[PDB]
């Protein structure tokens, strides 16, 4: 009824790394969560440092 | 609210008064 | 679609002040610094929009 929008979005936000800063801070971020895709992408280690 | 609450024994299990929001950051 | 397309070179703001006495300016200045008299403006349409 009174459609006003309680989202207010800035575009110097950036809502996906505030996210995926988040699920590191409170949980091992390692473990793999098919239902969201919760994978990180993790390089190599001794592919990176030879 | 201790009808809420679960029972260890005959007590209410209940949590810590100061232990109700959050206050995690981006370093801070 | 239609090619039309915009671009903003420069935008400049005016200001035209009123040459005012520097003695009727500071005395209008510190009249209008008192809670009773603030100045209240009200919207022509006032409406909410839904």
């Not at chain 3, 200001?15 to 209240?40: I, V, Y």
Request: proline share 3%; hydrophobic share 40%.
């Amino acid at each position: 009824a009174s459609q006003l929008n309680a989202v207010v979005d800035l575009q110097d936000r950036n809502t996906e790394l505030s996210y995926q800063l988040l699920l590191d801070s409170i949980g091992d971020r390692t473990r793999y969560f098919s239902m969201w895709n919760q994978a990180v992408d993790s390089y190599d280690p001794d592919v990176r440092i030879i | 609210f201790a009808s809420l609450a679960p029972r260890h024994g005959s007590r209410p299990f209940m949590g810590n008064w100061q232990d109700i929001g959050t206050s995690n950051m981006s370093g801070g | 679609v239609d090619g039309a397309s915009i671009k903003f070179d420069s935008i400049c703001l005016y200001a035209t002040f009123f040459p005012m006495a520097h003695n009727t300016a500071s005395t209008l200045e510190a009249m209008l610094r008192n809670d009773t008299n603030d100045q209240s403006f009200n919207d022509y349409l006032s409406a909410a929009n839904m």
